[PDB]
Amino acid sequence: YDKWEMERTDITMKHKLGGGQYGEVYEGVWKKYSLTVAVKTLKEVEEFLKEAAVMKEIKHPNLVQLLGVCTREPPFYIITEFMTYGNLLDYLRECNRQEVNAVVLLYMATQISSAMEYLEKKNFIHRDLAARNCLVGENHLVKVADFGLSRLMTGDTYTAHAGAKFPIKWTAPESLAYNKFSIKSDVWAFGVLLWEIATYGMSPYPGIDLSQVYELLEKDYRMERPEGCPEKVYELMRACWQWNPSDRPSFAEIHQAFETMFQES
């Protein structure tokens, strides 16, 4: 047992988080610090433990933070911080837009690009970047997470493809075509995430059937600039959606771009 192991009794387990929305994830309390936490449990063990191992290597203010694990006897736990306002997609859809205004949106985008710049530097790939996988805390804190939603979400967000489950409208073309994932396919998804933010959580390619998406992209179709979107933000989206992965900017470049816009605003 390493430095991450914590005693089961350190955590008060409360109810399942969001009525199964997240699978076997529970809201808990880290008693000694009076902090609310999220606790993922295991009803497969290999994948579970591999996740914990990845998380031990990630430390950034805009990434969900591992706090501990319980691995001595079942059920095993992965414990992370809990974020006050929950997932970004629902947050955007339900917020007061005078309060969560343009400067807040720029701040959120900046934080997300910072997280991704970090994963980029560490040679990690996210593979499912989207507003549904981000969390919002007080004072507009935003953290990137990965909830493993493809196997929990009901509806058309994820649909079968290449014998797997893909969120087609967030998926880079090369990932769709040749099942190739890289930090540049995350950059593509980040562009879609910008559009989610810009529209306060609309579904992308609205009114366009999933069946048409890949062909449209292949023939150079791209979502148009959302109402109220600054040209500079839209330029970033278009750069993220370059057909060729090597033509897309790095997260380092994206973050620098947003840093500048945020401070200017």
Ligand X SMILES: O=C1NC(=O)[C@@H](c2cn(-c3ccccc3)nc2-c2ccc(F)cc2)N1
Ligand Y SMILES: Cc1ccc(NC(=O)c2ccc(CN3CCN(C)CC3)cc2)cc1Nc1nccc(-c2cccnc2)n1
Q: Which is nearer to ligand Y, 120 or 234 (CB)?
A: 120
Measured N-to-C along each axis, helices 251-264 and 102-121 cross at an angle, to the nearest 10 degrees, of: 150
| Residue positions forming the annotated binding site for ATP | 17-25, 40, 81-87
Contact between 229 and ligand X (CB under 6 A)? yes
Contact between 89 and ligand Y (CB under 6 A)? no
Contact between 228 and ligand X (CB under 6 A)? yes
- Mark 143-182 with x for binding to ligand Y (rule: CB under 6 A) and - for no binding: --xxx-----------------------------------
Contact partner, 124, from ligand Y, ligand X, none, Cβ < 5-8 Å per class: ligand Y
Residue from 64, 129, 189, 197 binding ligand Y (CB under 6 A): 64
The region of 37-45, 163-171, 213-221, 229-237 touching ligand X under the rule CB under 6 A is 229-237
Contact between 106 and ligand X (CB under 6 A)? yes
Smallest separation (angstroms) from ligand X to the CB of 15:
33
Q: Of residues 175-194, which lie at the interface with ligand X (CB under 6 A)?
A: 194
Contact partner, 201, from ligand X, ligand Y, none, Cβ < 5-8 Å per class: none
Smallest separation (angstroms) from ligand Y to the CB of 135:
5
Contact between 24 and ligand Y (CB under 6 A)? no
